[PDB]
Structure 1
Amino acid sequence: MSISISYSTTYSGWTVADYLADWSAYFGDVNHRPGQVVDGSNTGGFNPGPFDGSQYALKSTASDAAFIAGGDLHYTLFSNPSHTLWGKLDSIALGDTLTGGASSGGYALDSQEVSFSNLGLDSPIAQGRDGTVHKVVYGLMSGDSSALQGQIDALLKAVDPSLSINSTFDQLAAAGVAHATPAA
């Protein structure tokens, strides 16, 4: 039930907020918007798809940045409420160089830098694009991780009120929340 965080040792002295502000800018905005959608460039993909998955994953068009959203995710395409991502969001993994897909046993990052697990997010279809899951993941598409940052901040303060996204990964490891992974 408590948030679990992984981090490359390279980021031990970073705050969660500072990492996510840089990651959002580094991945940038893939411009997934009317008249700008480009299949195979800014659509990403579901595992197993075609419009549902245990994972949704996308590579940046600006850098090698990529994310994988994990849970039980559903996309409505044209159906009311149109262009909604909803369902369960358990995890976000951030790093460089997306590989794999359904046929490989899932998506994976060549270089996973940071992950957030046990997010416990569950948004119903009826909330449409106002659902927390939709806003969290769309923010990762579009260079604004505010929604994710606020959910993590809330989950940390729920483990212990001394913790926040202004904590360093090292501090969160000392608190038992975070776990160091190998450096690239």
Structure 2
Amino acid sequence: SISISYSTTYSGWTVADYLADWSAYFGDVNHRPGQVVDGSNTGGFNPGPFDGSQYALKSTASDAAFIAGGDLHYTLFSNPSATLWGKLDSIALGDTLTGGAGYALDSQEVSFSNLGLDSPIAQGRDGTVHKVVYGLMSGDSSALQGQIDALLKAVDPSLSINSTFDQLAAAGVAHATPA
């Protein structure tokens, strides 16, 4: 079942409000045709170069960053091209990316783990893993939100992305860490 870690700063926040805030502050890195710049808005894999247990990306607007964890593969130019696929077990959100091939966030705000998301290569860019991560890269947490909402309801059908982190802690899903 999904497990969430949150800084006590966010106890009274809803998951949706947190995600919409973080995504707006991270912004859109403009990873799209004609706009990809190696070393600026590609992010990186650990161990990489195009596969690993982590994919991490820093904002180009702010100090926000995220780390996706699991078993992740990027097809680059191979068919189906520009597809991230594999198993997505976790998403960590916060600021100030450190490390590398592991990555960590200096300020880890919220992490969602045991996501259990998996997308085979055959689904291409329509895979859930691709859509969740590419959404974050593009300033849009909607895909992530939809997956979190379904996972929460699978544990306890009255929970949702409009639950506060404290409500999720009372339901046994979330765990606070010191600010």
Question: Whole-Å Cα distance in 2 between the matches of residues 123 and 156 of structure 1?
Answer: 20
| Alpha-carbon displacement from aligned partner over 1:48-92 (angstroms, at most 9, x marks no partner) | 001100000000001100000000000001111000000000000
Q: How far apart are residue 26 of structure 1 and its match?
A: 0.7
| Cα distance in 2 for residues equivalent to 1:154 and 1:35 | 35
Distance 2:161 2:132 in 1: 15
Show structure 1 runs of 4+ deviating over 2 A. none
Q: How far, CA to CA, are the matches of 2:24 and 2:100 in structure 1?
A: 25
Whole-angstrom CA distance in 1 between matches of 2:105 and 2:8: 16
2:155 aligned with 1:159:
yes
1:86 matched to 2:85: yes
1:76-134 alpha-carbon deviations (Å, 9 max, x no partner): 011110000000000000000000012xxx10000000000000001000000000000
> Which TM-score applies when normalising by structure 2?
0.99
Q: Note the residue ranges of structure 2 that are not aligned, 5 or more in a row.
A: none
SS at match of 1:162: coil
Shift of 1:144: 0.6
In the TM superposition, residue 38 of structure 1 has moved relative to its aligned partner by: 1.1
Whole-Å Cα distance in 1 between the matches of residues 174 and 99 of structure 2? 26
Whole-Å Cα distance in 2 between the matches of residues 38 and 78 of structure 1?
15
Give the secondary-structure state (helix, strand or coil) at the position aligned to 1:72.
strand
Aligned alpha-carbon RMSD (Å): 0.6
Mind listing any 5+ residue stretches in structure 1 that lack a counterpart? none
Q: Distance in 1 between matches of 2:158 and 2:34?
A: 45
Indicate the SS of the match to 1:165. coil
The superposition leaves residues 23-67 of structure 1 with CA deviations (integer Å, 9 ceiling, x where unpaired) of: 111100000011111111101100000110000000000110000
Indicate the SS of the match to 1:71: strand
Q: Take 2:147 and 2:33, find their aligned partners in 1: how far apart are those partners? A: 28
Calculate percent identity across the aligned residue pairs.
99
